[PDB]
Amino acid sequence: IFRYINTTLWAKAGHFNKALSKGAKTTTWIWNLHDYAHDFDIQQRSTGLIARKVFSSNLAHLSLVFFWISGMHLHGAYLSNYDIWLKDPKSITPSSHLAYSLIGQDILNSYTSEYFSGITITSGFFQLYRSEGIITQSQLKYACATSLIATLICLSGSYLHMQLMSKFTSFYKKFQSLSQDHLIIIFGSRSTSLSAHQIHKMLPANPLLDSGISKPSILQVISNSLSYTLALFSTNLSSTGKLLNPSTRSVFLSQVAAHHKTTGVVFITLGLIRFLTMYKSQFSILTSYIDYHIVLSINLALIASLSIIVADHLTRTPIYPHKSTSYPTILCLSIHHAWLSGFLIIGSGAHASIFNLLGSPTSEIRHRDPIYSHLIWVCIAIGLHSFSLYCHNDTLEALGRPEDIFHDNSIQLKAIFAKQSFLRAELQPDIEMLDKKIIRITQELGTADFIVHHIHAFTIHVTLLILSKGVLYARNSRFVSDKLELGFTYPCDGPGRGGTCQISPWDHLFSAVFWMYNCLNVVTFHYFWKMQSDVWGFVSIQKHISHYSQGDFSVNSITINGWLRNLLWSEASQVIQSYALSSICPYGFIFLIGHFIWAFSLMFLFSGRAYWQELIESILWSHHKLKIIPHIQPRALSISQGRAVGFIHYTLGGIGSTWAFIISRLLVLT
Amino acid sequence: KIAYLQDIPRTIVEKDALELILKNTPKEQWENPPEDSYLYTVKAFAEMYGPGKATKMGWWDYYRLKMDMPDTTRLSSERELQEIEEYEKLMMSGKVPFAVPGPSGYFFTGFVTQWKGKEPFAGDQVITLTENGLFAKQFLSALAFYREGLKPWQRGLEIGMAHGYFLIGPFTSLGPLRNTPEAATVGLLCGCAIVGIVSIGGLIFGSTIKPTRFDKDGDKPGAGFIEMINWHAVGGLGGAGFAHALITVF
Amino acid sequence: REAPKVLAGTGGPLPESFWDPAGFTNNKTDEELLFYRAAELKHGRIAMAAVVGWFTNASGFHYLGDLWLKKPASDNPIEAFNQLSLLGVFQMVFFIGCLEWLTTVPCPPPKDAPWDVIGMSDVLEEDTDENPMAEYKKIQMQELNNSRLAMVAIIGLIVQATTTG
Amino acid sequence: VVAEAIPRPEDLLDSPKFPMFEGSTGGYMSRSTRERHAITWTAKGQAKFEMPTGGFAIMNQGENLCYFRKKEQCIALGKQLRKMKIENYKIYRLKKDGTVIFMHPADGVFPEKVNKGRVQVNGRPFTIRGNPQQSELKFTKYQGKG
Amino acid sequence: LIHGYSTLGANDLSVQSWSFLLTHLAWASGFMFLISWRGYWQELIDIILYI
Amino acid sequence: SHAVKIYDTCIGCTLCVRACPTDVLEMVPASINAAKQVASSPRVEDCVGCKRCETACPTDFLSIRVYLQDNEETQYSLGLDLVDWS
């Protein structure tokens, strides 16, 4: 069985694809080898190998994630100031990340504690550890050990399943079994397990810390043995979320444990219900969507939506102790999950297109013109409406006519449904604050919030237009009637019919990545400006609030010039003036590098490969002149690869620019 | 009958599960199951293990076999197979089980709207409720542009009255002089200007495209359309003036 | 039954129980029975919207009427009708008058199915045999049974409001 | 070769030659276009195929007939049929007046198969580099068309 | 330049700031003519023409 | 309409004919190659311009050359579907 696991193919690069068997005649062979590496569908051998590869690769990636978790745990146990952060979280910035004293890189470590200098981490791992009752270094040691053991176990399982599974293997196709066991045993039987963990280790510990005994009598009290504290020790009646814990500025962990217990019960009951529930309508979906790419797209869309829900729920539904006051942590936790939501949504669209090209589509593709046409009209309507309210405000403010602009002190567009959406939270008529820092105050939504929400809707709709147009017009179109034979990813069909560049679903993803990036850059900026202007900030003992941006949002965000001046210029002073400043030197440098990479992408985005091919031939003349012949013949990047490289550099550079801009400012202000 | 489907031990697969497999699998595939089909594994094992053959297996081999066979719940029942065999029949017959999009999904309305039009290969004749229903057809036919028995000037007058009456509002309110004591004569002038501009555009259209669907027999081509556009301008003036009169008086 | 067969299998507790415990349909002609159904569906369709409108107004959502009266109108829908500005009521009557005119004279429903105000009969099948469709009779039951419930429900709301608050 | 009597698609509603196809919005846009292309073929079994205008279809055991706006769609369907070992398919262009023009297997033999009586049209008797320079033919019959 | 027109009054640089933003919009608008290529838009135009 | 020209270097592949999506090309008998056949383009009025024929041609430089003429486009060379020019 395992005697066929041989290294003889390690030296034979490109073995998996039969199109690469001719050998590396040109440099295009290298890029094709890298491109087809994970494309198990088109690789050689039967369908059973596809299942084995998919499952074992999933296990290998799971081992990789476990290794990353183990690295974070070891950094927290042996390369961090988590001790002093535990003792005083409101005066110590989290830091489990040092820099070596080479090339003066010592300037990157900054004062986080009197005994520690390092890079302020914004992953929120310290708050997670405190919410996980991790106090001693031994606990982090054993967490790291368990994560390393999990890495080894998952790696070994990925190794084994390449030969345990065979041609007869069918457990992956049993979707009823997968859904039932997943749902019940994981969402139900593991949620209650975490509820048990919290009830037996957090409530014995986190109340002890909040009770002021950071000593906890060392292990005499902290090491469990506290069955005289009661599970609902400090619920204080009320409703979950209406009253926060005054000490840690978060929801009481007893309520979180009850939530996990009840959610596990609900999931178990739903698994029991699924024995007899509503069906026979999603049944066409049931039979037509049993394929790798469709389920991958469905899961990607679902996980991305969950990621955006997490992004919006991690900030002003504070669960973690001492996390609402840690403003850089809140900002990072929102924005990182926002970006992941966008990226995984785009991936869902791509794999929907791939499923359409490999499998057979459904009924909705036959009236695709009305669908992707009313989508076009709605995109045009909300683009010519949302953005232009900004253009109108801008023009009339430049003209000196502020009474004719869309503002609160002018023609005002009230957010009617949001203002009547006091259902969410429904907190008492005041704010909450822990230590000179605002925990959460209700965002008073006005005209600017209305306009920016419509901008969000417009960008979302345009990205969805690109994605659905790629998906629905994958097999064929009025433009080209045999797009199915062209495959999933192709540069074009030729300069004929006026020009057929970028008709493939791959190119539709290529444009959709740009539009998703543009969509949630505005989301990032809206969050980053709104929180600073209207939520975060200092306090005055006379109940007066001094925010970080001093309420710039409601008065400046009504015009594009307001965004340019009060957000991208005034709030970029921290990152731009960050040279020789200990903590924020890398952020200024990375700001510069992000600008460089973003501009560098434009060389690939704007140019075609024929010019570069001719230039490469001109250079190859000089190489052949001096008897330097590369027998792997130099070829310029393929059209699809040029577009991919351009998109990757564009998004990476822009994301790095925002990343530095937000993080350096929040680190300086805090 | 087929050789390997007879006297198959229950331990390899149960009787009801095997019958469910045979029902789900198309009849032509029983003799030689394809590959990666539960019936293929049933054939590849029932021809090795049985009464006259190897009657025992290693525990791990039997464990792997039990995870290659269906678990009696992942197979469509008779009613589900009927659902598919009839849904596909509807779809191929040119009829669509009517569904309406909802919150990321669609509700089936339990209606069979015949989908392909009179010209089945025509893309714009696929009949929908909003364009080919009785109400939609009679509403479109009764519009001023389509109403039977209307002289071209009557269509123009009606359309112009509608446009002129409506166009006053966006200017007299939220306009540059929305707060001035008059604030409505400005809106009247702007609405009349919009009516005149669109009437000029219609005249351009009638002198360039020259639609001939309103011309009476033996007339200068496009004369009906030009008359309709001129009377739309007149009706726009009238409707704008009437809206302004109502605003000022009331 | 003969003539009540045109509205057969569409009422009663169970779908195929011609209730009529007053003889209101016997001796009546086919067109009269169809017209009686047209009255029933029209009452029920309005009743369904009436009940929904009652609840979205008795809970505190009367925006157009709070923004027109410049004050939060009373939650009691009967009392909120009085507070609603007379311009609003007259426009409300006119809009329904236009809709009632539109359906009757310009775009009349057929005479065999006088309740097809949207006119699905020209694109509907209603007589095929598919299971994943042709359940149009069932959705006719849900419209009628829900609407009949809404008719007695909205009267209960009005009667109780006008009497026991 | 004898051209068939392909009637105008607006006058052949409900024909027995039409394959069972789902029908989509991708079909030829009536009310704006009057030139239609028709492809006919004779099949042996009701094998499912894919329409060039979205949606799938099932052939008839006998004659088949389909209407399309563009010749490209007809040729795509012809290649799809020929992959299923279905020869003897003919593609016609229908003029607005109803004139039937026989297009694809023009001489009855597919263009990839040599047939006598054909002559190399648009043939040039030299290598592609043998073309004259554009600069030489200025203001002649071949001003920008060397 | 950015302080030209704001929610504090305007300077004689208001035209400069407005043209600054307009030229930024013009510069970014030409990205789609350079990055996005024809076939996508031809399909989009076919859909609009269908409408 | 475009201009599709066939040059003497043709070796009778028939690949260009098979790759054409609108039946522009055809095979004609000849005597300038071992295959005794060369391509021809009798129906370039149907040439959309996809240049698949050029992709399929294996001669050192294409024996079939398609010259794009954008100021010449007809309804067939543009692949018009929603609109008729006849």
Ligand code: CLA
């Ligand atoms: C800032 C640059 C910019 C701008 C303005 C646009 C604008 C647009 N893109 Mg686009 N795009 C861009 C960059 C840009 N793109 C880049 C860099 C890429 C990367 C490839 C793309 C990729 C892309 C794709 C892939 C898609 C779009 C789409 C759209 C359209 C949808 C939005 C809409 O209709 O709003 C309206 C347009 C506006 C510009 C809003 C403002 C309008 C002004 C302010 C009001 C009117 C002015 C007034 C009348 C003055 C008159 C003119 C004067 C001479 C008198 C729109 C035309 C989508 C589309 O067309 O679908 C509908 C689509 O599919 N874009």
Ligand code: CLA
């Ligand atoms: C669970 C997630 C998941 C999974 C399993 C897959 C799986 C697959 N995808 Mg996919 N995809 C995903 C998410 C996912 N994708 C997302 C989120 C997107 C949106 C961006 C896409 C977009 C996408 C496209 C457009 C295509 C695929 C393709 C494929 C297939 C082959 C992939 C391959 O060989 O690439 C090999 C792997 C690589 C080339 C990785 C190279 C690294 C990337 C490109 C750059 C990342 C830069 C890095 C983050 C920053 C560097 C740090 C810097 C500081 C230096 C395979 C089925 C291809 C296909 O043919 O499908 C059949 C294809 O054309 N996917």
Ligand code: CLA
């Ligand atoms: C506008 C009122 C109205 C009308 C016109 C109809 C009409 C019809 N119903 Mg019907 N129905 C209604 C309301 C109405 N329904 C309500 C509210 C209910 C719920 C109890 C029902 C329950 C119901 C069943 C269960 C069945 C019908 C059936 C029928 C059809 C047979 C004819 C018939 O029963 O008498 C038509 C004439 C009338 C209904 C006269 C209206 C009532 C008179 C005026 C006296 C009622 C006054 C009342 C006592 C006082 C008002 C206040 C009250 C709420 C307390 C016919 C199409 C049968 C059918 O078609 O099945 C195949 C059948 O089986 N209906």
Ligand SMILES: CC1=C(/C=C/C(C)=C/C=C/C(C)=C/C=C/C=C(C)/C=C/C=C(C)/C=C/C2=C(C)CCCC2(C)C)C(C)(C)CCC1
């Ligand atoms: C919102 C709504 C809607 C819509 C509506 C509409 C669309 C309306 C319109 C309306 C209109 C749009 C109206 C109009 C009217 C008009 C008028 C009423 C006019 C009149 C005029 C006149 C009367 C004139 C006269 C004259 C002349 C003719 C000339 C000379 C002078 C004079 C003045 C004498 C719907 C249903 C969708 C739904 C919901 C609700």
Ligand code: SF4
């Ligand atoms: S592909 Fe080129 S070489 Fe081959 S037959 Fe066609 S024109 Fe001649």
